[PDB]
């Protein structure tokens, strides 16, 4: 249902091995942990997490872009990404989130297919 | 020192009323307000913070695109576009934030100048 | 050798039935057809080229964004996207192309892999 | 009537010295020569054409973006970028057009105004 693509817009190539957290906010407000893990040779994490888990809410996936670029030599401007949104059942069942990345700027989409 | 615009990608203009909060990590890790606006008529939203008060930091900048989607009748992805960034560790420098809104989608980009 | 992948930031999918028209430069510097077609449900279009055809040169992909705006009744800047580079032996192999559109922008991007 | 604005998403600045030629589709459908510049320290410019010339049609904004690059010793992907629009076709309309590159990477997207 939750799937990461991550790809590297100054060397053309998938973002591998970039650390992605995925956060459940909270009744309080905060930020409960929900899914983790690195992206694949294909810049792409699966498995995060099931239907019955996914639950409408609002989810936070933070994509750990200033580890990736300091592992290539190259000093970048942000800490991380960050792409907040809500989960709602009334839309299609499968959500995508990408992200293209450049050290001082990233860009994000949601592709939501059923 | 710190300016922000956005850009609608959907009417091709400046995104105009668009509410922008800035936080500033503390020493105990909470993200402190440090100052908010909203974009003018040409989408820009300047007078944030002045040299004094910008001090190093990790900041974040929430640009609050759902609620400018939604005060034109659209139902957006996201909740808002989040940049996160060190800022002035050595020495001032004067930042642009810059974002490209879409309904499913964001860019933003940083200008980062030594005066 | 040769994908395109196309994608709409309005809606939040695949941009389906978009024509695609990919050229390669010719000796006297004009544009010779050398592939087409539409994207399918998941806005790719793949099948285009052979490794054998797939020689070094200068290739461009057309992208008819304007078309896939006004069947959706949306009045779009662009007459449509170019997306037009080399392609280099000394690389990888398979190229993929991505856009991502909008009605007044689109941001494209090359992965490039073995 | 005409602007483009160029950044740099690698070093985080203005994209200074990018050459731009802008051309028009005559009736023949050659792109004929329109005009053409370099982006400023500020990664603007300005100046290409006036409210007479810039009459109704089909426009062609190409930024050299590999002879960007190439300048600064980096192999780029892409040959340039290329905006491809109708202009003043509902009466005189002001552009700028602003893209964002990376060596495997752009976007671009429109501002148009009414004055
Ligand atoms: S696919 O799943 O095989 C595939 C292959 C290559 C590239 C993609 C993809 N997904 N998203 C993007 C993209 C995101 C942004 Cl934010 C900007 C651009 Cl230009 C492309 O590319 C999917
Ligand atoms: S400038 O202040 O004259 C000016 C005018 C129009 C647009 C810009 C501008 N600033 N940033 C961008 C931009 C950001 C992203 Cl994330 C993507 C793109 Cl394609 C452009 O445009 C500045």
């Known amino acids: 249902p939750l799937m990461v693509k991550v790809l590297d817009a100054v ?10 957290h995925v956060f459940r906010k909270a009744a309080d407000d905060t930020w ?6 690195k992206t694949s040779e294909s810049g ?8 019955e ?7 936070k996936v933070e994509i750990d872009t200033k ?4 592992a290539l030599g190259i000093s970048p401007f942000h800490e991380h990404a960050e792409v907040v949104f809500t989960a709602n059942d ?10 293209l990345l450049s050290p001082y ?6 592709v939501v297919t059923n």
Chains 1, 3 share one sequence.
């Open 11 to 20: 060397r053309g190539s998938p973002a591998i091995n970039v650390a992605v």
């Open 32 to 37: 409960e942990p929900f899914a983790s893990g």
């Open 44 to 51: 792409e994490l699966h498995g995060l997490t099931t239907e």
């Open 53 to 59: 888990e996914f639950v409408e809410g609002i989810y």
């Open 67 to 70: 580890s990736y670029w300091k």
């Open 90 to 99: 009334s839309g299609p069942r499968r959500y995508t989130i990408a992200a």
């Open 105 to 110: 700027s990233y860009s994000t989409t949601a």
